[PDB]
Coordinates of C-alpha atoms (C1' of nucleotides) in Angstrom, one line a residue:
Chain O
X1 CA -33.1 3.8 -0.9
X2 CA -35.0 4.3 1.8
X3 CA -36.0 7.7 3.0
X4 CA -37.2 7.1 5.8
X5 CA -34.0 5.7 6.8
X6 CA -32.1 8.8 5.6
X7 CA -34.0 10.7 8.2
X8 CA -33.2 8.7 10.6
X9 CA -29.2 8.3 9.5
X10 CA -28.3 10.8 6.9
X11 CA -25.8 9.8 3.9
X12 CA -22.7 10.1 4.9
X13 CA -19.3 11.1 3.6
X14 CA -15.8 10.0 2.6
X15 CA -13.2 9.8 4.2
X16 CA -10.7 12.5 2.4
X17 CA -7.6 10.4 2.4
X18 CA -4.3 12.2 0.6
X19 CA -1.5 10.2 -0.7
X20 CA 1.0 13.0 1.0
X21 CA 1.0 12.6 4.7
X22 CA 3.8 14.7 4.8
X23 CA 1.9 17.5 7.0
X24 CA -1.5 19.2 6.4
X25 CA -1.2 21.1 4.0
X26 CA 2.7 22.1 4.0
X27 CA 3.6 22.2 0.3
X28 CA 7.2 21.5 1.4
X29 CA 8.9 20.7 4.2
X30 CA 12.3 20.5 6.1
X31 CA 14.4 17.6 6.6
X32 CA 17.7 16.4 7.8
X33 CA 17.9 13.6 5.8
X34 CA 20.2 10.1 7.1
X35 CA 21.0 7.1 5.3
X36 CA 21.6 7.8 1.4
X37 CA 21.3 4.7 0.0
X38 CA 20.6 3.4 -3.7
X39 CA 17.5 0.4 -4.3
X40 CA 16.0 -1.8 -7.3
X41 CA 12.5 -0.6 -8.7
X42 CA 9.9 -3.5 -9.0
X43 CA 9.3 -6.1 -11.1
X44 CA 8.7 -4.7 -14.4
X45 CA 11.5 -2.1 -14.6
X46 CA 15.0 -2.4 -13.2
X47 CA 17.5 0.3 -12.5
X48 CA 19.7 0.6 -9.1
X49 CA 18.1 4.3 -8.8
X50 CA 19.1 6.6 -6.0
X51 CA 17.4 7.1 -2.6
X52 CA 17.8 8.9 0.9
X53 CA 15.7 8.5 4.2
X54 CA 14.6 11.6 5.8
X55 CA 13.8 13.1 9.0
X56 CA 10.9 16.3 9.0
X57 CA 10.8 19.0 11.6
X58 CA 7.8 17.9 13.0
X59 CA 8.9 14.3 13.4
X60 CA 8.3 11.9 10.8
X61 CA 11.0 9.8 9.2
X62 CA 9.7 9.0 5.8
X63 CA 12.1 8.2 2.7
X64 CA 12.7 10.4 -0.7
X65 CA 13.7 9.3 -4.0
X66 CA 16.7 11.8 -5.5
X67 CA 16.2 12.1 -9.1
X68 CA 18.7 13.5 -11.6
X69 CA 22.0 12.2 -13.4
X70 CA 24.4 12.5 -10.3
X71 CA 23.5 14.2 -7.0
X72 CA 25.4 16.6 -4.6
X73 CA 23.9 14.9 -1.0
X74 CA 26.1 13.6 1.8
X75 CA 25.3 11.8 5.2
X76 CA 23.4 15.2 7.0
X77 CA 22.7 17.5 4.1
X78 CA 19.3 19.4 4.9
X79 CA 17.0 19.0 2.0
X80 CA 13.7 20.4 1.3
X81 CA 10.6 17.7 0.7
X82 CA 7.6 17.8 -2.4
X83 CA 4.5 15.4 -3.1
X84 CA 4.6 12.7 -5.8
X85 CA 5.2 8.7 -6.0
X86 CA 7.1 7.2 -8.7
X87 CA 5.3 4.1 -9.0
X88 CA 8.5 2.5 -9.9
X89 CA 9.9 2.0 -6.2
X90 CA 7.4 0.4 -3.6
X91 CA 7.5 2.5 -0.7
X92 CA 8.0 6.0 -1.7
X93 CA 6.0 8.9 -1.9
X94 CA 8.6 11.7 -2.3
X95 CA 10.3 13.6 -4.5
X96 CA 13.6 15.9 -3.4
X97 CA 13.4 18.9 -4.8
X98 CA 16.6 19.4 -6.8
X99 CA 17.9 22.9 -6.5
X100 CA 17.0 24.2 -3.1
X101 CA 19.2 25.2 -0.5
X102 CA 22.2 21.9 0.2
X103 CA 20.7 20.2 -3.6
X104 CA 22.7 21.5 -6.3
X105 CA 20.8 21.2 -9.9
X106 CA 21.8 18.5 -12.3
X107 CA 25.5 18.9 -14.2
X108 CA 24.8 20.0 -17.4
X109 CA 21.3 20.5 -18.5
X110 CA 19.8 22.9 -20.8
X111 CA 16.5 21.2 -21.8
X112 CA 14.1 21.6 -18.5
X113 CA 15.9 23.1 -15.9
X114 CA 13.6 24.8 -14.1
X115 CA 12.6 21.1 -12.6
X116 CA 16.3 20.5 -11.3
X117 CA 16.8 23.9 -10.5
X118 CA 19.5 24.4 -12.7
X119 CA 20.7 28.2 -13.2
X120 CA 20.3 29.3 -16.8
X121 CA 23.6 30.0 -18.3
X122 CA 23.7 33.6 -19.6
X123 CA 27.4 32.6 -21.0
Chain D
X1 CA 43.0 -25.1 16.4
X2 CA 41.0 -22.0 17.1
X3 CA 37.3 -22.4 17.1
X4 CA 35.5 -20.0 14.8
X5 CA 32.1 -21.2 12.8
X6 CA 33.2 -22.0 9.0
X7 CA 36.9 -20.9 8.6
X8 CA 37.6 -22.2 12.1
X9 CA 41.1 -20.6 12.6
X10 CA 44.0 -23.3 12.3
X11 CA 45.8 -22.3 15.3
X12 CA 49.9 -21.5 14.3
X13 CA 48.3 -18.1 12.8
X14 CA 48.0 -16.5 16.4
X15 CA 50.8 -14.1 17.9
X16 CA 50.1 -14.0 21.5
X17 CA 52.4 -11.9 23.1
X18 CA 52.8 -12.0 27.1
X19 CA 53.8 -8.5 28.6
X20 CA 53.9 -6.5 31.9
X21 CA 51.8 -3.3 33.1
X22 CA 52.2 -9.6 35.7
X23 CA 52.2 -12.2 32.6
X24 CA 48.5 -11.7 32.5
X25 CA 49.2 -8.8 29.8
X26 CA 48.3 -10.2 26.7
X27 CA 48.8 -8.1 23.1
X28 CA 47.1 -10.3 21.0
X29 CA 47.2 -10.2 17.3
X30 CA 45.6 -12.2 14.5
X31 CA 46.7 -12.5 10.8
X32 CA 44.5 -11.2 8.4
X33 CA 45.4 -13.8 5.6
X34 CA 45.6 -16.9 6.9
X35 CA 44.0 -19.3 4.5
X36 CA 40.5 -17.4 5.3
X37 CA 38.1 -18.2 1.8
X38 CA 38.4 -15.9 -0.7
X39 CA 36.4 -13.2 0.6
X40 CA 36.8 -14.1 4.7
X41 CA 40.4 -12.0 3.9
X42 CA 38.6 -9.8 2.0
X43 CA 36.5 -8.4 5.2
X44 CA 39.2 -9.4 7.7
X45 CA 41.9 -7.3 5.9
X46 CA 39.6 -4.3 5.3
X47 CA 37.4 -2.9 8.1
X48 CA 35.8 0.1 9.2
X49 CA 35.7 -1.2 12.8
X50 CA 37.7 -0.3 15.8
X51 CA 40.9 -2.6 17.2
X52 CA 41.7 -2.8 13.4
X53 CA 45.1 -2.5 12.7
X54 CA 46.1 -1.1 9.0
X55 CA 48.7 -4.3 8.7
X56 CA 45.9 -6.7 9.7
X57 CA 47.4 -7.7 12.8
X58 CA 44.7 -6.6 14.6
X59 CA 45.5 -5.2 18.2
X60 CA 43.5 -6.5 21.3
X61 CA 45.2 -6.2 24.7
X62 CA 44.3 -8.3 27.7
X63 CA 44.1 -6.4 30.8
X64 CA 41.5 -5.7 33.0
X65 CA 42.1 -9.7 34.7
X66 CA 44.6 -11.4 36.7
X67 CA 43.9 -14.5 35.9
X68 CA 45.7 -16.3 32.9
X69 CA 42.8 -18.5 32.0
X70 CA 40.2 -15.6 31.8
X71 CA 42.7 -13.5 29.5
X72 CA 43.0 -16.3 26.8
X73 CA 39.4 -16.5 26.7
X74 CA 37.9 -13.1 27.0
X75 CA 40.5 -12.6 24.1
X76 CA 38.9 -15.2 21.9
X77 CA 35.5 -13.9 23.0
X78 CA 36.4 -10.8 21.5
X79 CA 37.3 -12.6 18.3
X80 CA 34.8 -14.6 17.0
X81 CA 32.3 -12.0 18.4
X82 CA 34.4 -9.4 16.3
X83 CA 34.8 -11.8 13.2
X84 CA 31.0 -11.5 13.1
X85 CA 31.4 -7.4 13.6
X86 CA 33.2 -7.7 10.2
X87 CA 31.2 -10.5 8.3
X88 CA 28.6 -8.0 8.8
X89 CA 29.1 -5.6 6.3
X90 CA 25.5 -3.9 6.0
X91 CA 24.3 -7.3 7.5
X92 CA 23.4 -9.0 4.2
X93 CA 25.6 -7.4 1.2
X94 CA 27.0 -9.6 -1.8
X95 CA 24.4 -8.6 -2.7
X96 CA 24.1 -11.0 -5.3
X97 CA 22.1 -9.7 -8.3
X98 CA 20.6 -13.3 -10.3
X99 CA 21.2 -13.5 -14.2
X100 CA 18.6 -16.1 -15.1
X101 CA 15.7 -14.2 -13.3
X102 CA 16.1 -11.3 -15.4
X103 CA 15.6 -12.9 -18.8
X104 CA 12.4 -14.2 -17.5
X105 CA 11.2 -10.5 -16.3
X106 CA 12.4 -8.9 -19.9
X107 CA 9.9 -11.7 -21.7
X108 CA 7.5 -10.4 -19.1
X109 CA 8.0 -6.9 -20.5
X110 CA 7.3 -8.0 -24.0
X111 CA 4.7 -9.6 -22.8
X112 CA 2.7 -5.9 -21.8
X113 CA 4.5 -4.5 -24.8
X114 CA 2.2 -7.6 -27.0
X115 CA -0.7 -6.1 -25.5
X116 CA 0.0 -2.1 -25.5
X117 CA -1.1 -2.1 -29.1
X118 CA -4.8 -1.3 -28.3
X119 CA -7.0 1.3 -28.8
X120 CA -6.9 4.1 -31.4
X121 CA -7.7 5.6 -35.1
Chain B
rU1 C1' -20.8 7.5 25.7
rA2 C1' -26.7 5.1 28.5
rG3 C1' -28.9 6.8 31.9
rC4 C1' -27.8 12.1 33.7
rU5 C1' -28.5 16.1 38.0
rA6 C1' -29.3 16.9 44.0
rG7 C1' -29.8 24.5 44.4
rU8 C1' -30.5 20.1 41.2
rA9 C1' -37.6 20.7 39.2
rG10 C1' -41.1 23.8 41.5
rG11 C1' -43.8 26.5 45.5
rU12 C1' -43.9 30.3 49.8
rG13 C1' -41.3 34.1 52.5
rG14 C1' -36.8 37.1 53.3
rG15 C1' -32.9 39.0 50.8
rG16 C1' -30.6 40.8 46.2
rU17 C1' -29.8 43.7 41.3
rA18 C1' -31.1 48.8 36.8
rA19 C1' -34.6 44.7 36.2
rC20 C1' -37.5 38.6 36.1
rG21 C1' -35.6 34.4 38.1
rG22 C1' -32.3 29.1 43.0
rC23 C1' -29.6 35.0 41.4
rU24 C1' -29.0 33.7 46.8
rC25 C1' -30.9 31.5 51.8
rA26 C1' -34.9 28.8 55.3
rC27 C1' -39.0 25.1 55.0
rC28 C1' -42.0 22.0 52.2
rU29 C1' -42.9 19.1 47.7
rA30 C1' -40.1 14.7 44.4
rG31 C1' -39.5 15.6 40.8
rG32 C1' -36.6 17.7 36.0
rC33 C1' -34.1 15.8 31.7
rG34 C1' -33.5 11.5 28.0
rA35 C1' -33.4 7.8 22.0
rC36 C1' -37.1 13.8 17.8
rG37 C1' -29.5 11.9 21.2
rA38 C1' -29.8 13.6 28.0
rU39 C1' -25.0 13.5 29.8
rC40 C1' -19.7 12.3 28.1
rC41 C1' -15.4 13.0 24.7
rC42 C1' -13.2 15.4 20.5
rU43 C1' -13.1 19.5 17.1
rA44 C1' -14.3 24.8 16.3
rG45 C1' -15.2 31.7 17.1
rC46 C1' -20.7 32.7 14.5
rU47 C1' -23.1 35.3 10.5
rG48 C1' -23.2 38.6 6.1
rG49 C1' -20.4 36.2 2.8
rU50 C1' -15.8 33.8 -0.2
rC51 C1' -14.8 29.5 -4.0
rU52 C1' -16.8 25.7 -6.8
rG53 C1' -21.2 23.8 -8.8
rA54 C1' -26.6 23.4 -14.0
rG55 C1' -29.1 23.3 -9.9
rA56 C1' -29.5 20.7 -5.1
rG57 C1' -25.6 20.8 -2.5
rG58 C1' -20.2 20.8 -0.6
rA59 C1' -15.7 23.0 1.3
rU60 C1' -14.7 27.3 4.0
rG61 C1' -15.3 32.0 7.6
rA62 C1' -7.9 35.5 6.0
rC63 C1' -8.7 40.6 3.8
rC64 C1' -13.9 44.9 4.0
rA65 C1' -18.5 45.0 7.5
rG66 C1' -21.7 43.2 12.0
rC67 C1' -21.7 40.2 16.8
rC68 C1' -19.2 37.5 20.8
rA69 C1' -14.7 36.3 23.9
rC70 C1' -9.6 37.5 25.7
rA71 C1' -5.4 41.2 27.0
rC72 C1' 1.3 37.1 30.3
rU73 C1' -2.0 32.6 33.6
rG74 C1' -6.0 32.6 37.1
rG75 C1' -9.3 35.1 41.0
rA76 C1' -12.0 39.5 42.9
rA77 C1' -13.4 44.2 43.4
rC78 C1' -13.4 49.4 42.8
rU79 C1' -14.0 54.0 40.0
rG80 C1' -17.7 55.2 36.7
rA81 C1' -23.4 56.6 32.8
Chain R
rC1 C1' -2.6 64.7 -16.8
rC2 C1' -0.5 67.3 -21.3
rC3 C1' 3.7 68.9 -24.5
rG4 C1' 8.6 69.0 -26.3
rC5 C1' 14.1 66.6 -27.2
rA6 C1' 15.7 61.8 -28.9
rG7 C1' 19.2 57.3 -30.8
rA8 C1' 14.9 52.1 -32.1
rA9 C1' 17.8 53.2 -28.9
rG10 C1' 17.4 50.4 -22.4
rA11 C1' 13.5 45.8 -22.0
rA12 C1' 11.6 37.4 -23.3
rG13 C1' 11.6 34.0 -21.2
rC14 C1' 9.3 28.9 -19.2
rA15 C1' 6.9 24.0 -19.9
rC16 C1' 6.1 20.3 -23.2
rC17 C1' 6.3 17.5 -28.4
rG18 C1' 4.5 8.1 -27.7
rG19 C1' -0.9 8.2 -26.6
rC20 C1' -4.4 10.8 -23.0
rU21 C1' -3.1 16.0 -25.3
rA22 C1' -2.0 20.7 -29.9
rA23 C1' 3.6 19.7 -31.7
rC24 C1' 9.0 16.4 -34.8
rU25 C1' 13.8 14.7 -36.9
rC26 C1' 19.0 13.6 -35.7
rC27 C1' 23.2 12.2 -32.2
rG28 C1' 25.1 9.9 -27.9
rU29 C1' 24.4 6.0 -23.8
rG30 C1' 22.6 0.6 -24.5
rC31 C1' 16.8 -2.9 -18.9
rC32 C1' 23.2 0.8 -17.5
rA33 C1' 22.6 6.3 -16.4
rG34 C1' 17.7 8.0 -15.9
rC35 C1' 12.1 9.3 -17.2
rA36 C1' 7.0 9.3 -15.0
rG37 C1' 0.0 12.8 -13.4
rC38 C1' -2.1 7.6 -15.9
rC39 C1' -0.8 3.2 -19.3
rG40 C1' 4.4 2.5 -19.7
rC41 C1' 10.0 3.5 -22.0
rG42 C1' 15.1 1.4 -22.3
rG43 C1' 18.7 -5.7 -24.1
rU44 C1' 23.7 -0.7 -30.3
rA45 C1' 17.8 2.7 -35.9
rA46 C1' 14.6 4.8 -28.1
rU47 C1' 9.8 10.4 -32.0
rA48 C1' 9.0 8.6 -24.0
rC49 C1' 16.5 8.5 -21.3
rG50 C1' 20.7 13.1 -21.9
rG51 C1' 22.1 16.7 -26.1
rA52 C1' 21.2 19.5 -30.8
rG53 C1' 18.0 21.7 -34.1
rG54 C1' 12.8 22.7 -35.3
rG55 C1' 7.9 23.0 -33.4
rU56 C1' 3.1 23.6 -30.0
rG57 C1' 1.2 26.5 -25.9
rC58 C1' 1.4 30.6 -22.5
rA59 C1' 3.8 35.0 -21.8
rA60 C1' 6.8 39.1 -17.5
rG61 C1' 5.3 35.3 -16.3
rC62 C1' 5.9 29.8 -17.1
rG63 C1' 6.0 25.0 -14.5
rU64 C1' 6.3 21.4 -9.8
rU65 C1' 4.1 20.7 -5.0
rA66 C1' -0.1 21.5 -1.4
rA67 C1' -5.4 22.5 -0.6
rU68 C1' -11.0 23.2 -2.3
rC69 C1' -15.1 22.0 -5.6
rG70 C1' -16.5 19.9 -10.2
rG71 C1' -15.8 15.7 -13.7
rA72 C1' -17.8 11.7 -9.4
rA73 C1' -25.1 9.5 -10.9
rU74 C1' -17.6 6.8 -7.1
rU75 C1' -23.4 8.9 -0.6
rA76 C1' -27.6 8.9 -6.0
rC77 C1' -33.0 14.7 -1.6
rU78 C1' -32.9 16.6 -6.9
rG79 C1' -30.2 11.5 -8.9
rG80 C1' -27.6 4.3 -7.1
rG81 C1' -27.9 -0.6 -5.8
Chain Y
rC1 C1' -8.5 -2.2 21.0
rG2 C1' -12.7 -1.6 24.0
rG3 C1' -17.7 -2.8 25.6
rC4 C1' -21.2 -7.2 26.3
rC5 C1' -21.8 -12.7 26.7
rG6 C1' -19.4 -17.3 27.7
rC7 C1' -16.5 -22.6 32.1
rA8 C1' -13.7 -22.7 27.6
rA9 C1' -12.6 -22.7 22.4
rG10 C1' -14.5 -18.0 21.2
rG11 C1' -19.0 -15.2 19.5
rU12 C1' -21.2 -10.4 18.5
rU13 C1' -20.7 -4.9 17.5
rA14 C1' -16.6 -2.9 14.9
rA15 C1' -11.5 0.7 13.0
rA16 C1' -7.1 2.8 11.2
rA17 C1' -2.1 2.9 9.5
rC18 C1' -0.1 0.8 5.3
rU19 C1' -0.1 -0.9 0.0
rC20 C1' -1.8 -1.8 -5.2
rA21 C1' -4.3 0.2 -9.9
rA22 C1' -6.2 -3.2 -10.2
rA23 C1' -9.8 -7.2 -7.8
rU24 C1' -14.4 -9.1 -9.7
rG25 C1' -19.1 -11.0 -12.9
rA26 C1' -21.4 -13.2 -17.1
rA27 C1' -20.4 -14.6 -21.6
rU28 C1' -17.2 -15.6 -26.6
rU29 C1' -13.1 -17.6 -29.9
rG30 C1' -9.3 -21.0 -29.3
rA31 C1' -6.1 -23.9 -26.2
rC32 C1' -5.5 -27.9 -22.8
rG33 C1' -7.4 -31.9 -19.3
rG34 C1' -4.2 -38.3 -15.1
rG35 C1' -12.9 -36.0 -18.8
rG36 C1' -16.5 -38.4 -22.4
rG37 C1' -17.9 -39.9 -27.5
rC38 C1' -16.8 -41.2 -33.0
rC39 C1' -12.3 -42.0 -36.3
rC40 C1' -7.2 -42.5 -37.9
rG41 C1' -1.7 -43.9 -37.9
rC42 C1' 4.3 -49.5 -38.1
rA43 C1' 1.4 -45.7 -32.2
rC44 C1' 1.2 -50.4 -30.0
rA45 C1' -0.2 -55.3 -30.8
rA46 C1' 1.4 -60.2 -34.3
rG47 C1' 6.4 -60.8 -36.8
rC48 C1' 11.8 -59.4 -39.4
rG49 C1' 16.3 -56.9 -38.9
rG50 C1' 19.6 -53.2 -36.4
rU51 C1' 22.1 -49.3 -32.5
rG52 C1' 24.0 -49.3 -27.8
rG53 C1' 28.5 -54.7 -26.3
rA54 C1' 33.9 -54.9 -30.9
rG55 C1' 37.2 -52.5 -34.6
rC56 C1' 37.1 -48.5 -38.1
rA57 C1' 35.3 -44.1 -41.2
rU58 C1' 32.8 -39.3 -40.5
rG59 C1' 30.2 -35.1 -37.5
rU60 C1' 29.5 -32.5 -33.1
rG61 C1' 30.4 -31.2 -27.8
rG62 C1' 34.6 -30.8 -24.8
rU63 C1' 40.0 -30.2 -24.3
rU64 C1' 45.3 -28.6 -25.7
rU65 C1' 47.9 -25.0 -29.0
rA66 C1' 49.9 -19.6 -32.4
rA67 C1' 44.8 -21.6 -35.4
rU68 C1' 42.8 -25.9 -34.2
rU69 C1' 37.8 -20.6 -39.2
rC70 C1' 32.1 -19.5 -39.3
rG71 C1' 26.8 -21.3 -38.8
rA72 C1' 23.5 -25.2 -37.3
rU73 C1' 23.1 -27.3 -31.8
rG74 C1' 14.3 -30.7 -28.6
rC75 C1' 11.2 -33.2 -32.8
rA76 C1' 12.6 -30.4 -37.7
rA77 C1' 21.5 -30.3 -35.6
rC78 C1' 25.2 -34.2 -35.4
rG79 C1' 28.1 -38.8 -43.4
rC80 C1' 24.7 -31.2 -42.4
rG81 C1' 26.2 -26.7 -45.3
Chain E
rC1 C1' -8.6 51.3 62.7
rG2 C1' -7.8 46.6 64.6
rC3 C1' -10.1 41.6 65.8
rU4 C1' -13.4 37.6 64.2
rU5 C1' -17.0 34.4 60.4
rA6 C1' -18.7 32.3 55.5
rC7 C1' -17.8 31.9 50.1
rC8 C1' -12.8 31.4 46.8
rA9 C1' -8.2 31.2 43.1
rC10 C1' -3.8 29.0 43.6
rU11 C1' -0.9 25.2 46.3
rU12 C1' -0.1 20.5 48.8
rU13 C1' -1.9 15.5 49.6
rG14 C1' -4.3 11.1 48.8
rU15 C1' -6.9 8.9 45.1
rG16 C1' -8.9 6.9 40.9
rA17 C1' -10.7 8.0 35.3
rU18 C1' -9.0 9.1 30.3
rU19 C1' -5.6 9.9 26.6
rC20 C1' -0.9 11.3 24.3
rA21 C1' 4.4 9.9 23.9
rU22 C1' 8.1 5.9 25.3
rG23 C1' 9.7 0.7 26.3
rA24 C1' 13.9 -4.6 26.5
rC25 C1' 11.1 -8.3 23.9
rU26 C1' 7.4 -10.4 21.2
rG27 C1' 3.0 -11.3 17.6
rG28 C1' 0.8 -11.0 13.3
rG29 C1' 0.3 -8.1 8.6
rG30 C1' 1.8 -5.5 4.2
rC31 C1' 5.6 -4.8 0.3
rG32 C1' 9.9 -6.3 -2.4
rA33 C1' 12.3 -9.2 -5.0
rA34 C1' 11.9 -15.5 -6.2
rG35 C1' 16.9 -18.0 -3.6
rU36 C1' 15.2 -23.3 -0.1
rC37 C1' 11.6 -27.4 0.1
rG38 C1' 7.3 -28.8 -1.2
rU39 C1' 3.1 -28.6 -5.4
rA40 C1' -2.5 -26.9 -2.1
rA41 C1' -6.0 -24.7 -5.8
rC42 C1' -7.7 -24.1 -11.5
rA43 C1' -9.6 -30.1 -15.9
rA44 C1' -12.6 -35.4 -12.1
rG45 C1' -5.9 -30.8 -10.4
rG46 C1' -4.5 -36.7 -10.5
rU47 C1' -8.2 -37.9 -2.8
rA48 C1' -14.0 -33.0 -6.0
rA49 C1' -13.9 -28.0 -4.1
rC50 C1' -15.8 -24.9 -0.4
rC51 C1' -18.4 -23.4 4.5
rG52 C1' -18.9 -24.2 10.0
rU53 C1' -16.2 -26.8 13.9
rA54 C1' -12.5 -29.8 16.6
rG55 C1' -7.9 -32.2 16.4
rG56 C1' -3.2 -32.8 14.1
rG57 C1' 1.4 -31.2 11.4
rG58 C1' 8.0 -28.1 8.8
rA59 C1' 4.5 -25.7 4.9
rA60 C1' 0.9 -25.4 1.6
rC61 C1' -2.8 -28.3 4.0
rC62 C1' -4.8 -33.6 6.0
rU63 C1' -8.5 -36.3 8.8
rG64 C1' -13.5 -36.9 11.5
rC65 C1' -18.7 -34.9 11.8
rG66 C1' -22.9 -32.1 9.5
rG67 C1' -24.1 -29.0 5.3
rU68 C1' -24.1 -26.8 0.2
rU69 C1' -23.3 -27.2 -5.3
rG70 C1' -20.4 -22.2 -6.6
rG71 C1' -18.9 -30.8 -8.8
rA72 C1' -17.3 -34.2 -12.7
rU73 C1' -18.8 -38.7 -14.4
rC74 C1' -24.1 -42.4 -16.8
rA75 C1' -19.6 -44.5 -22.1
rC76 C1' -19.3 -50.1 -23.5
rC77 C1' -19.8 -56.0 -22.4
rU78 C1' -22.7 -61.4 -20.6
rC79 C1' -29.1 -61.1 -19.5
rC80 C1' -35.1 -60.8 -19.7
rU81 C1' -41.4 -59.3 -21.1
Chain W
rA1 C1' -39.0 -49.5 -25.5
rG2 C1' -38.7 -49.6 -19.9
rG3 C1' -34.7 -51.3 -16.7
rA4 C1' -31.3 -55.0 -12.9
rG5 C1' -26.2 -55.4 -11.6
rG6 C1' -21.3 -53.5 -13.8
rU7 C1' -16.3 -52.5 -15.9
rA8 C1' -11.3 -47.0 -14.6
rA9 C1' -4.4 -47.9 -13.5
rA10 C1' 1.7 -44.8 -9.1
rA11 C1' 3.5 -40.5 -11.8
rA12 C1' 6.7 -33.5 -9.2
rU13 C1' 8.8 -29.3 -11.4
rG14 C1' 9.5 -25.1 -15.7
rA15 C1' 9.5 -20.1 -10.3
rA16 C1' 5.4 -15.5 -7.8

RNA sequence: UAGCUAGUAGGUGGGGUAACGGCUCACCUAGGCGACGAUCCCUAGCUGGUCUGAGAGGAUGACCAGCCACACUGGAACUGA
RNA sequence: CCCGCAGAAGAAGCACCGGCUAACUCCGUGCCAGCAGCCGCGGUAAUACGGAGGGUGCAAGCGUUAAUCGGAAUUACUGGG
RNA sequence: CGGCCGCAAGGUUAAAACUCAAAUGAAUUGACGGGGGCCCGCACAAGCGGUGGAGCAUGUGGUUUAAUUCGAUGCAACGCG
RNA sequence: CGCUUACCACUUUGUGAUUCAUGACUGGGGCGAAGUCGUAACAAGGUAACCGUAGGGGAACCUGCGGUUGGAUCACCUCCU
RNA sequence: AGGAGGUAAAAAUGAA
């Protein structure tokens, strides 16, 4: 406790550290992405799931985890970049966001398509 | 014999071909299935590397020296330094996925699946 | 980041401006500031307020209103209330 | 703004349904493809994976991501060791 | 990393990136100990006779073939069904 | 009007201070799977463990010195008032 | 009942 320590060094404050350091604030962001490649999760699960490396505007060269059955990338592709880990693979922190400009949406999906930006089918 | 690390070449499976641009012009080839193991034909035969000819006879040309002795070695240089270029392939790839490993992991999963039975009404 | 400053702390006289003053000169004095944080480095327009919160607080200062600063970069002056 | 003509005529999607957290069955694939905010799911009866149908919620908006505060008495002055 | 001290080995003050959703404390029921105590048992000791060394019957593993059917396959399968 | 003096921005030079990027190579760390050898710790972990320090070694770690308990172990047999 | 000596033997791993 104290006080008359507090007057002398106030209480102080946490650091406000975010789990997305892909730029303040930027809720998505460009990148030019190289090296699409495929990994094993940990331990606990196991799947050969598909990843991609990836190359922002303002530098950094973090990796991003392409979800979906089946995906439309190739070696350059540009790519658009959202928050969010999947716990399952150690050393990710990003999810592709299916849909946008060179990331087609899934083949075939009716149930939840808005995540996977596919079009609805009016036919 | 031709000195490579683990296959080690038996030399007879080397066409070196003397030519003028001199008799320092060597066209060397190599065979690409010359009693290499298994797989060692497998990465010899297919290659996304340069000097790689589609019949596996490889095509390296010694020019550049006038000497004989330099052109028989700088060729051989640029063999086993090229056998490595293709035993390479993404520097560690089999890649070798255990079976035995992965019963043990499966128990470990029925292991948390024994103890997600907790709390509720 | 531990000592910082030498027109720098003050006095007298001249000068100077709409006006007080090292604002600016001459001489003299040797002080002034500093752990209740001086200097240094980094960040940032400030407030009324906005949002959240039971409250205390915390984040923040775009839009409407008030103040300050700039007009391609930097320097000076003029005209003029 | 008000009145008249007029065929219901021109106008409903989006997330989710193992628990947290309101809401379920069936089919296909079989630690493979994939799901995921947290714990986890999947080795041929998967309510968690894809599809179908039904259902819960909100609704010309519905979800993901990013940021702020609260929950956090996890900076406790109010109010900790 | 820097400052300070030290002949030196280093000491002191003192971060962040990154990564996980756990790490940790006391205590409880069992388990186990090349820990202890009490007690048991052809467990060993004191004795008798066998297997494995030989031939043959039967069963299984393995192997060959068109089949050499299926299950059992530490104790608690192998003259078993 | 022209000439001349002081103050000055910018420029050039020397010269250090600080910081941001970059660098062949190298060091240690985290994470991931558990393949190689070993089996250090948890029971007295089969040499009690740990702290400080020095030395040594392919690795966990070993040894010497001092310290702490966050260590176990007082079971039987010949003997005396 | 107090108290004195004293008696104990090499042996890994099951895979993060």
């Amino acid at each position: 406790a104290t006080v008359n320590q507090l007057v002398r060094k106030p209480r102080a404050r946490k650091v406000a550290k975010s789990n997305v350091p892909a730029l303040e604030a930027c809720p998505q962001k460009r990148g030019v992405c190289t090296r699409v490649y495929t990994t094993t999760p940990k331990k606990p699960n196991s799947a050969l799931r598909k990843v991609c490396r990836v190359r922002l505007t303002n530098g950094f060269e973090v990796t991003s985890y392409i979800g979906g059955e089946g995906h439309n990338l190739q070696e350059h592709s540009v790519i658009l970049i959202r928050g969010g880990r999947v716990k399952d693979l150690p050393g990710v922190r990003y999810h592709t966001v299916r849909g946008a400009l060179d990331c087609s949406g899934v083949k075939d999906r009716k149930q939840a398509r808005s995540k996977y930006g596919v079009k609805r089918p009016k036919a | 014999i031709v000195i490579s690390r683990h296959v080690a070449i038996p030399d007879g499976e080397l066409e070196i071909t003397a030519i003028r641009a001199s008799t320092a012009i060597h066209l060397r080839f190599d065979i690409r299935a010359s009693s290499l193991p298994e797989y060692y034909k497998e990465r010899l035969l297919a290659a996304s590397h340069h000097l790689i000819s589609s019949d596996g006879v490889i095509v390296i040309k010694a020019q550049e020296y006038r000497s004989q002795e330099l052109n028989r070695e700088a060729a051989l240089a640029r063999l086993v330094a090229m056998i490595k270029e293709l035993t390479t392939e993404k520097k560690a790839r089999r890649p070798t996925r255990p079976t035995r490993a992965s019963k043990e992991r499966r128990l470990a999963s029925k292991a948390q699946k024994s103890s997600v039975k907790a709390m509720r009404g």
